[PDB]
């Protein structure tokens with residue numbers, strides 16, 4: 001698809017068998033999701049944004065569908081105000097910015 | 100142009116007579132620039148993101164040049180860790196996300 005920016009670029013994602021809403025975000029290096037359960041071991045990460053830093057759980061090689069496109073990669077879980085799809089997974093679905 | 104997402108999508112902007120670097124950011128509602136002087140009146144605002152809220156000054160009807168394309172809109176000025184071009188100005192240059 002071709003997505004304009006007059007409204008927030010919200011899409012449906014599927015993770016752990018569950019549907020959720022998430023933001024397509026060219027300004028984010030990483031993908032970060034609100035609290036949920038994921039399989040396997042996790043590693044620590046500190047991430048920074050506009051108001052300061054938060055601590056999150058890093059899960060590698062997680063299966064995730066984004067607007068009907070399949071990806072497998074790194075997902076961060078923690079106290080984010082919103083679900084965000086960053087450049088690590090935008091590149092797996094072949095997304096570009098055009099003007 | 101077509102911009103890929105392997106690296107941060109950084110471009111040159113002209114604002115207030117000054118040349119700066121800024122991030123093309125589909126996940127931001129607003130345009131936010133590091134401390135600088137701008138002409139005309141302003142009012143205070145609180146804006147949020149990943150680590151909480153920051154206090155900014157809101158300037159309306161500011162002209163800006165973004166990678167060679169002229170636009171006008173609201174610009175917020177304050178202690179942001181990075182300069183960001185948000186959706187209020189990306190719409191004006193015709194930017195879209197494609198996959």
Ligand SMILES: CC(C)(C)NC(=O)[C@@H]1C[C@@H]2CCCC[C@@H]2CN1C[C@@H](O)[C@H](Cc1ccccc1)NC(=O)[C@H](CC(N)=O)NC(=O)c1ccc2ccccc2n1
Pocket residue numbers: 023025027028029030031032047048049050081082084086124125126127128129130146147148149179180181182183185
């Ligand atoms: C997500 C993470 C990997 C941590 N990356 C980032 O946070 C980087 C950090 C960079 C350096 C600091 C300056 C911002 C840039 C760009 N950001 C991405 C960037 O796209 C970021 C993503 C985001 C969206 C929603 C909620 C939180 C965070 N947006 C923002 O920071 C913008 C700023 C603004 N216009 O007010 N926030 C919002 O547009 C926004 C929308 C709804 C909200 C609801 C509740 C609380 C906060 C909310 N913030």
Ligand SMILES: [Cl-]
Pocket residue numbers: 044045055
């Ligand atoms: Cl920890």
Ligand SMILES: [Cl-]
Pocket residue numbers: 171172173187188
């Ligand atoms: Cl505006």
Ligand code: NA
Pocket residue numbers: 138139140158159160161
């Ligand atoms: Na003004």
